Each structure stands twice: as C-alpha cells, then as structure tokens.
Design an enzyme around this catalytic site. Sequence first.
Site, mmCIF file in Angstrom:
data_model
loop_
_atom_site.group_PDB
_atom_site.id
_atom_site.type_symbol
_atom_site.label_atom_id
_atom_site.label_comp_id
_atom_site.label_asym_id
_atom_site.label_seq_id
_atom_site.Cartn_x
_atom_site.Cartn_y
_atom_site.Cartn_z
ATOM 1 N N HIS C 92 6.352 -8.749 -18.714
ATOM 2 C CA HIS C 92 6.668 -8.146 -17.427
ATOM 3 C C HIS C 92 7.469 -6.900 -17.716
ATOM 4 O O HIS C 92 7.945 -6.725 -18.828
ATOM 5 C CB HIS C 92 7.512 -9.109 -16.592
ATOM 6 C CG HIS C 92 6.799 -10.369 -16.209
ATOM 7 N ND1 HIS C 92 5.887 -10.421 -15.176
ATOM 8 C CD2 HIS C 92 6.869 -11.625 -16.712
ATOM 9 C CE1 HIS C 92 5.422 -11.653 -15.060
ATOM 10 N NE2 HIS C 92 6.004 -12.403 -15.980
ATOM 11 N N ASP C 95 9.200 -0.991 -12.737
ATOM 12 C CA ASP C 95 9.018 0.395 -12.355
ATOM 13 C C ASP C 95 9.788 0.617 -11.053
ATOM 14 O O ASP C 95 9.533 -0.065 -10.060
ATOM 15 C CB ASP C 95 7.524 0.653 -12.131
ATOM 16 C CG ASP C 95 6.782 0.997 -13.416
ATOM 17 O OD1 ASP C 95 5.535 0.986 -13.423
ATOM 18 O OD2 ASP C 95 7.429 1.343 -14.413
ATOM 19 N N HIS C 97 10.405 3.228 -8.107
ATOM 20 C CA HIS C 97 9.909 4.456 -7.481
ATOM 21 C C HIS C 97 11.034 5.460 -7.299
ATOM 22 O O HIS C 97 10.781 6.648 -7.172
ATOM 23 C CB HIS C 97 9.266 4.166 -6.132
ATOM 24 C CG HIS C 97 7.898 3.564 -6.239
ATOM 25 N ND1 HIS C 97 7.105 3.329 -5.137
ATOM 26 C CD2 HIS C 97 7.175 3.173 -7.317
ATOM 27 C CE1 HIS C 97 5.957 2.799 -5.530
ATOM 28 N NE2 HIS C 97 5.972 2.702 -6.846
ATOM 29 N N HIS C 132 8.537 -2.433 -8.594
ATOM 30 C CA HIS C 132 7.581 -3.473 -8.907
ATOM 31 C C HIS C 132 7.280 -3.527 -10.391
ATOM 32 O O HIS C 132 7.475 -2.550 -11.121
ATOM 33 C CB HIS C 132 6.280 -3.302 -8.101
ATOM 34 C CG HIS C 132 5.539 -2.033 -8.385
ATOM 35 N ND1 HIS C 132 4.628 -1.922 -9.415
ATOM 36 C CD2 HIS C 132 5.531 -0.839 -7.738
ATOM 37 C CE1 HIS C 132 4.126 -0.700 -9.418
ATOM 38 N NE2 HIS C 132 4.651 -0.025 -8.408
ATOM 39 N N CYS C 133 6.830 -4.696 -10.826
ATOM 40 C CA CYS C 133 6.294 -4.864 -12.165
ATOM 41 C C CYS C 133 4.961 -4.111 -12.241
ATOM 42 O O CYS C 133 4.241 -3.993 -11.241
ATOM 43 C CB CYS C 133 6.050 -6.345 -12.412
ATOM 44 S SG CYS C 133 5.514 -6.715 -14.074
ATOM 45 N N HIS C 142 0.079 -8.312 -11.028
ATOM 46 C CA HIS C 142 1.513 -8.657 -10.953
ATOM 47 C C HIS C 142 2.108 -8.333 -9.582
ATOM 48 O O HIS C 142 2.845 -9.137 -9.010
ATOM 49 C CB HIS C 142 2.305 -8.031 -12.102
ATOM 50 C CG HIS C 142 2.098 -8.731 -13.410
ATOM 51 N ND1 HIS C 142 3.133 -9.255 -14.156
ATOM 52 C CD2 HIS C 142 0.959 -9.015 -14.090
ATOM 53 C CE1 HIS C 142 2.641 -9.820 -15.245
ATOM 54 N NE2 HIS C 142 1.326 -9.692 -15.227
ATOM 55 N N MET C 147 5.482 -9.626 -7.350
ATOM 56 C CA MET C 147 6.450 -9.039 -8.253
ATOM 57 C C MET C 147 6.828 -7.639 -7.821
ATOM 58 O O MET C 147 6.517 -6.657 -8.488
ATOM 59 C CB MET C 147 5.965 -9.057 -9.703
ATOM 60 C CG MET C 147 7.135 -9.043 -10.670
ATOM 61 S SD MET C 147 6.754 -9.714 -12.292
ATOM 62 C CE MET C 147 8.346 -9.494 -13.050
ATOM 63 N N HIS C 252 6.567 -3.197 13.844
ATOM 64 C CA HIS C 252 6.840 -3.080 15.265
ATOM 65 C C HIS C 252 7.792 -4.202 15.642
ATOM 66 O O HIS C 252 7.536 -5.375 15.349
ATOM 67 C CB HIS C 252 5.531 -3.202 16.068
ATOM 68 C CG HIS C 252 5.729 -3.109 17.552
ATOM 69 N ND1 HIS C 252 5.257 -2.056 18.301
ATOM 70 C CD2 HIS C 252 6.359 -3.933 18.422
ATOM 71 C CE1 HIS C 252 5.592 -2.230 19.567
ATOM 72 N NE2 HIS C 252 6.265 -3.360 19.668
ATOM 73 N N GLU C 276 7.592 3.200 18.812
ATOM 74 C CA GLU C 276 7.043 1.892 19.186
ATOM 75 C C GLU C 276 6.550 1.150 17.930
ATOM 76 O O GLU C 276 6.924 0.007 17.687
ATOM 77 C CB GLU C 276 5.953 2.007 20.275
ATOM 78 C CG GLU C 276 4.627 2.619 19.795
ATOM 79 C CD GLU C 276 3.624 2.832 20.904
ATOM 80 O OE1 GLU C 276 3.243 1.846 21.581
ATOM 81 O OE2 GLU C 276 3.194 3.994 21.069
ATOM 82 N N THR C 277 5.734 1.825 17.133
ATOM 83 C CA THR C 277 5.174 1.267 15.918
ATOM 84 C C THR C 277 5.228 2.377 14.884
ATOM 85 O O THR C 277 4.848 3.517 15.167
ATOM 86 C CB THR C 277 3.720 0.806 16.141
ATOM 87 O OG1 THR C 277 3.695 -0.169 17.188
ATOM 88 C CG2 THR C 277 3.111 0.185 14.858
ATOM 89 N N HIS C 303 1.807 -4.503 13.127
ATOM 90 C CA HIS C 303 1.092 -4.454 14.393
ATOM 91 C C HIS C 303 -0.435 -4.259 14.283
ATOM 92 O O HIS C 303 -1.069 -3.778 15.210
ATOM 93 C CB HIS C 303 1.754 -3.479 15.403
ATOM 94 C CG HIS C 303 1.495 -3.823 16.844
ATOM 95 N ND1 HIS C 303 0.234 -3.828 17.396
ATOM 96 C CD2 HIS C 303 2.346 -4.129 17.853
ATOM 97 C CE1 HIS C 303 0.313 -4.151 18.676
ATOM 98 N NE2 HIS C 303 1.584 -4.335 18.979
HETATM 99 CU CU LIG Z 1 2.304 -4.779 20.844
HETATM 100 CU CU LIG Z 2 4.352 1.952 -7.808
HETATM 101 CU CU LIG Z 3 5.141 -8.868 -13.992
#
Ligand SMILES: [Cu+2]
Ligand SMILES: [Cu+2]
Ligand SMILES: [Cu+]
Lengths: 337, 336, 336
Positions: C92, C95, C97, C132-133, C142, C147, C252, C276-277, C303
């Site tokens: 494993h 990473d 971001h 994430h892995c 993964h 993960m 939402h 709203e969303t 939503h």
């Molecule tokens: Cu709705």
């Molecule tokens: Cu990524």
């Molecule tokens: Cu992993």
Amino acid sequence: ATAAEIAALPRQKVELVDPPFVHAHSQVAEGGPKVVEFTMVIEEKKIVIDDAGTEVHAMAFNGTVPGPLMVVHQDDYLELTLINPETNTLMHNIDFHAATGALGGGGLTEINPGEKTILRFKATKPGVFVYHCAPPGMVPWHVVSGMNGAIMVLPREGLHDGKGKALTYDKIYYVGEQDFYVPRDENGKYKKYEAPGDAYEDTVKVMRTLTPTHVVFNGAVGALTGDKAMTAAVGEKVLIVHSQANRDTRPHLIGGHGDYVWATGKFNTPPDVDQETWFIPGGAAGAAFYTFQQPGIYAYVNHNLIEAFELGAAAHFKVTGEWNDDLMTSVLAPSGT
Amino acid sequence: ATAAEIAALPRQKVELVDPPFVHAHSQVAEGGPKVVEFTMVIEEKKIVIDDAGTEVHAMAFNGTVPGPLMVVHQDDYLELTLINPETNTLMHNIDFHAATGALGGGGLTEINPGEKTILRFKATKPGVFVYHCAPPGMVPWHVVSGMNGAIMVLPREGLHDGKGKALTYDKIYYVGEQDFYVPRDENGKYKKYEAPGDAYEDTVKVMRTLTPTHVVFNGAVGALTGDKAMTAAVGEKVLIVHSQANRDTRPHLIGGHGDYVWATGKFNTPPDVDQETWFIPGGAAGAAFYTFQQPGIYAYVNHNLIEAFELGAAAHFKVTGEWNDDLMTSVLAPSG
Amino acid sequence: ATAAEIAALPRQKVELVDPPFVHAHSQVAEGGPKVVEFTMVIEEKKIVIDDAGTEVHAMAFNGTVPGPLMVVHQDDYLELTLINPETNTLMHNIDFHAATGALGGGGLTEINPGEKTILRFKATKPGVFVYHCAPPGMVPWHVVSGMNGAIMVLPREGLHDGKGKALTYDKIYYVGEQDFYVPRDENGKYKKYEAPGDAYEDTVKVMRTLTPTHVVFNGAVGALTGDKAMTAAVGEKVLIVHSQANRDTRPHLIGGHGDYVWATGKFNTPPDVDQETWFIPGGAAGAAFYTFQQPGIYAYVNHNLIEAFELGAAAHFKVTGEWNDDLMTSVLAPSG
Ligand SMILES: [Cu+2]
Ligand SMILES: [Cu+2]
Ligand SMILES: [Cu+]
Ligand SMILES: [Cu+2]
Ligand SMILES: [Cu+]
Ligand SMILES: [Cu+]
C-alpha cells in the site's frame, strides 16, 4: 415577520401555464413582499414519451412533465395548494429546494388520494430551484416518473450580471429534462403496463443500471420541435431555465452560447460568461441568458450527444432575422475539389 | 467592421501540428484582427486503440484523434478550408462551439467525398472551445468515432489571472479525450468491420448503454505515456488544454495541481485556483495552468480511476530538475 | 525553508478520530508554522455494506472507510507515519492531492506488509483535498476498496466568504462517499470471498461497467443514520466536508442549503452561495457551510436519487430547536 405581519401582506393568485412557457410575471418586483398563491392538482396519467408510442405511467404536477415553473421574488411567500385527487392511487407530497425545513415541505404535504394541503414558505434566496415529490421509501420512483419541476425566485431588483449591471430578458422558457427508465422485453421492445403499480419492480431494475432509456425535454422525445419548437429573433434576449431533478445534464445551445449562465442556478453566485456548454448537477436547476445574433434553426441539447440524439434530449429554436456574414460566412460552399 | 474593413484585414496561413503539440502562435496578439487560415483534410481509416489490436473506424480531422488545436485571438476570424477526399465514404461537416450561427458552421460545411468547403467565422469570445463533425441524424456517431478537436481563442493581451496580472506559459499541450464504444461478440471479443457503415448499428447499441469500452487520450490507450510522455522542467509554466466533445471528464495532474483552471474553458470567467481535480462537461474544453515545482514522473488522468487505469484515460509527464525537500521529503524510507 | 529551519519548528502530535467526526483543531492558526504529526495503520478487513450482509474486502486507512480527516493550516508540514502490518497481504502507499511531488507521496511511501514509512510534505494550498492509496497497476482497485480519505488545509486566518467576512463553524463533519462494485452470482446474489485477492478478478469485471452496485457514506448503507445521524441545533453553523476519490457526486442537504459552498474544495476559489445541490467531481473533496434555521430531520444525500435511495448514498441530520413558521408553515394540513 410575525403571523400578523404576514396576514397583512397582499395576496396575488397566479394561474400556472404549461412548460416551456412561464406564467406572466414582472422581472423587477411590483411593490413590497406578497403571498403568491398557486394551485396544482396531481395527475397519475399514461403519457407517450416518443414517436413509437412508448408509455410511462407519469406522476404529473398540474398534468405535465415537468410540472410548471412558479415565479416569485425574494422574500415573497410561496403559498401552494396541492391537491391529490381521489382518482389517483398513491400518496404524494412536494419538496421545494427553495424552502427551508421539513425536508423542503415534504414532511408537511403528504397527501393521500382524495386529500389536499396548503404549504407556505418564505423564498429567502434568489435563483432557480428544483421541486419534486419525495414520499419516504419511494423517492426516486416518483421523481423519475416525471414528478418534478422548478421555481424561479427573482431578485426584487430583477436580474443583474456578476458586476451590478441589469439584465432584462425579452422572453423566458422553462426546459425540464427528464430521465426515464422504461423496462424492455426479451427482444428489447419497451413493455406496457395496465397500472402504475405493475411497472414498479421492472422499473426499479432499470433505474439500478443508472442508465436511462430516454432523456427528454418537456416529457417526450422531440417535444419541443416542429410547431412546438421554441422561438426567438435576432437581438432577442432569452432566459432559458433548465432543471434536472435526478440526473446530471450539460446544456448547450447549438449555434449559440450562454452569454451569462448561473450554472448553479443561484443569482447571488456570479454567472459564468461566454459559455459553450454548462453543467447542471442532478437535483438542481440552472439558467442561461443569451442574445440571439443569427437567424435559423438551433438545437438546444444535453451535450452528451448520445443522450441528445439517441435518447431524446434535443429541442429546437426557430429564429427570425437577418444573417450576419461578419459573424459567419460560407466563403466557398461545398463544391468539388 | 464594415465590408471593406473586413476585406482589408491581413490573411495569414498557419501550418497545423498533430496533438498533443500546438502550432506556432503568440500569446499576446501582434497587430490588429487577422483572418487566420487553416486547412484540414478528413481521413477515414482504421486505427488500433489498445494492446489487444482493437480497431475503430476513425473519422479524423487532419488524420488525427483528436483533431489539431487551432489558435487565434479574440476578434480574429478563423477561416477553415475543410476537404473530404473522394476516397472517403461518408459526408462530414464541422461545428465550432466558438462560432455563432448555422449550428456552429455545420449547416454551411456539409461536404460529400470529393468536396471541399471554406468557412469563416469571427472568434468573438476568448476561451478554449470544442469543435466537432455533426452531420444531421448521425451526430454522436461521427463524434465518438473521433471526429472532434478544439480551438483556443486567446485574449488579445494574452492570459491573465483574476487580478489582471499576466500569465505566460512556456509551453502548451492539447489533450483530447475520446470515449469509444466498440462492439463485442458474445464471447466478449471486440468486433472488426470492413467499412465504417457496417459498424453503425452495433456501435449505436453500445453507445446507448452510455458506457464506453475505452476512454483514451490522443486516440489510444497509452498514447501519451512511456516514450510519448509529455515533458516539462521544474520552474516551467505549462498550459494543458483538455477537451471532451461527448462525455464528462475530471482531469487531475497526479503529483501536481491546476494553479489556475478555467474549468468552463472561457477566459472571461475567472479561473479557479489551487485545483486538485477539475471538471469539464461533455461538449466542452477547459484549460489548466501549472508551474512545475518537482522533477519526476507525473500521471495526468481522468480521475475516475477506473476510466484512467482500466479504460485508458492516463497520460504521463516527464519533468526534469532538482528535487525540493521543503515541499516533500521522505523522512523514513519504507522499511521493516 | 531550509532543513535546519524545518527541524527547529514546533511539533504537534494529533490523535485522529473516526469519521464523520474530526480531530480537535483550531480554525485560526495557533502561532507560526508547525510540523503536524499523524500516524495511521492500514487494516485489510471485511466490511458489511448493506442489510443483505453484502461484504467488501476493505483496505482501510486507520481501520475506517473513509480514512480519517487530517486538519492542518496552510504552510504547516504534514508528517505522516504510515504503517502496513504483517497481518495484511498487499503493498500500500499514500497519495495526498494536497502535496507536490512523487505522485502526491505515493512514489515515496510504498510499504509491504511489515513495513512503515514517514512522509513529510508542506501544505502550501488551502482547501479540502482527497488522499488515497495508489499502488502502480492496482490503483482503482485499492481506491474502490475504500482506501481513501481527505485532509483539510485551513487558511491561517480561518475560513472567509468571497468578500473578507470571517466564517466560523461550530461543528464539522467529514462525509466520505464510496462507490463499491460487488460481484454477483447467476441469481443476482452478491458473492462472498475469503481473501482480498480472491475477489480481484470478479471485482474488476464489475468496475469496468462503470456502474457501482452500492454508493455509500462512511462505508455502508445507512451508516450515517440512527445511532450515527449527524447532529446540530437551530443557529449552529456546520461545515460538511465531502469527498469522493473515484466518482462524481452531487451533495444536497434536504430541508437545508449550502449557504457557502467551496464546490472545488479550494479556499482561495470564492465559495458559491445559496446552493441547493453542489457538485464534486470524482477525485476531489468539497466543503459546504450551513447555518441551521429549522429543527427536525434532514437527509443529506447524493442527489442522484437512485444513488441516494436505491444504492445507499443517504445520511441524516437530527437538529434540535424551535420551529420557524415565518420560514415555513402548514396553512392547511393534509385533509379531505
Ligand atoms: Cu431534492
Ligand atoms: Cu488521486
Ligand atoms: Cu492500498
Ligand atoms: Cu457540439
Ligand atoms: Cu408523487
Ligand atoms: Cu464526420
């Protein structure tokens, strides 16, 4: 405001009109806050969604898919009388994304066939907002059966761009986009059902694929074409409100643009400009403002072109006026090499 | 401009360059409006898109998938000579999302095999914009056969951030992302066809599932990886133009960021900043500006990682220079 | 900063807590830059994701899906000790971001079972960011085994709106949304396996359909409901951080709104308002700020209502306080 203050406010009764048209309204608010009254009857009805005659047991606010656009101004109250006629078979309600509390109103508007309710809410935020039915445990089934629409809460001072300048449209259209999930037989033909209930299990299976069989404007493939095509003229300023209660869309005016686009649908969020294709997430409404510059036929589409041209999400504009060769010209028309 | 003013504008022919590369241009416009002239020949040809010999009957502007990036400035005119050789079997046209009228130009450029056409439009709005073929009644089929590209309409004074400070890139790449829908026989083996039309019905069946079999950059799995990785150096400023004519994408520079991202592709809409993953809706192009800070291999992906790593939507950058331990360091290397 | 300068900075050890809760932190930065220390042990474990007993072989940072939220301030250093116990079967890594270089840290953190590593990176950009892995050649596997998680890098002066006004939350919750791809037998019953490797081939087949069988918050259908409903009171300001490492989502708050939404998750990009969303592309995190005005139950959903209510992407808030009849009232309750 107190109960007494709200009671003292003017009432205005509005007659709804079928999409893509929008009931008469004023862009800039006339006077102070009002209680704007709407009535809608819910119809469970068979509708035809394509030229083949494919059927959906629709659940339709005001008898249409989408339900009609309600227009108020910020800080008005929207007071809706919702009627579930005894001829229907299911409980229904309404959730306004514009509203605050009780799941958008759904918790307070659950009506069995033969019942009615009146819900009032303060429209505190300007923009376009989805509304839809959402009976607990049966939510997406009602929504993807067409039981959704939108409202517009205009700023009291009308529309403006991101930078203070007034924007006044000449006309407005409401395009409700609907994903349908129609069961197929073994030979891949769409199934027909006697009652709405008969379709449930089969429809849920299709829903689970997350792949609609149809994606349509105004309830059917090609609904906004032919003598039902939308219309404009060169120089005409058009606001296009677009909603999708369940699924993403990416509106695009083929041959045009979105000069100002409130992609999130919220007027206090500055609009994007000069847009080719904008994006409205499922569960939201958006609005685009455009001044037509060229005459002729336009297609207004969801620009997943399979969705537009195979599944149904394409409308037309017919635009009158003089062609502008500065903007575009055929220097050499298709001719032998 | 009046009729005589338009006629008096300089005309300039520009030679195109295959993606991910971009033809010669200046970021700041030199002199006033010009009529910038391009020519593209349409090629219908079988291409292999993966390591299993899977074929697509490509429909390719200038012979490439995506079609090449054309670069002009706001208020220039783009004047395209589009040629459909008599060896092709299908009618084609071109729709520029940058243009106004006649469906983007498609109404004016329907060319059968053995025909050519010349379209001029004024590039009135700054941004990156999709272009694609769109013959009435067969629009998505041409598009998902790879018949799409993009243009860039630079502001006359070049790019700027949200405060009007100039942003000048050292290099620019164009990543065109393509969703393909390749039919399979009942054993799951991809089918081959003699002519493009023979694949039409089977391909539309796949298209209707809304599930691409491949999602690729520059026309094929791995086209922008290995010996074909894009390059930069620490300190270099890079613009990455990304398009998707039919389907949503979510670009991400793995190891980097989009320092400035015009996610909607339009330069009058202020860029988002410090982006991890941006979103470009189907039918649009977007552009991201990054200054490389670390050397090494980067991956550039559609960050649906299934699309990136199972379906083909992954490119690489190979970046030279000196490692910066302030930004990142291995305090304890992997150890028992 | 030089290595010497970094070595002289104050250290702070943080104790992580399980989502949707977030570890103790200050919104406005406490003094100058620090090296903020976190430790996470990776656990490969079966998780049950629905009421049908459906199992996933999870690969879980700190034993949870999603992994926990780490909170630092801009220009702090995040120093993670990552441990892969000998009880695990797979290599494993991690990473971020938020980080710059070595694919976000993955290139420097590849640990086999029985190994550990320590990674330090400078948190140069404020916002919420996915981690994430991503083992080379096994990346989406993964990630869709759960993960993944997120971090928040707060501005040193805390959150603000687009126009300089301070935004101070009273509560914060981290909702990690997960798309799962569970194999089914000939009768449509979900398959169970007795080792993670056993499920690989079948799971890859499902992943390639781009159609999750489940879409869940906090690792399971109904996870953030009942005993785990999120809570608030009328008047309370809540920040909801939401991540999705692989697939798009459209959060939402049913009954509420996103008053300020950093839809891209990046705090230097002004928030959208009155939402709203909102939309978070796969591979990103976003954040929404909301002041509750009504008591009662809220549902917080993706939503796409099929994904929310058929596939599992629904959480609840239980909110205490006085009902506001000005905002909403039943003029006529459901009646004949
Ligand atoms: Cu709705
Ligand atoms: Cu990524
Ligand atoms: Cu992993
Ligand atoms: Cu187009
Ligand atoms: Cu209903
Ligand atoms: Cu074509």
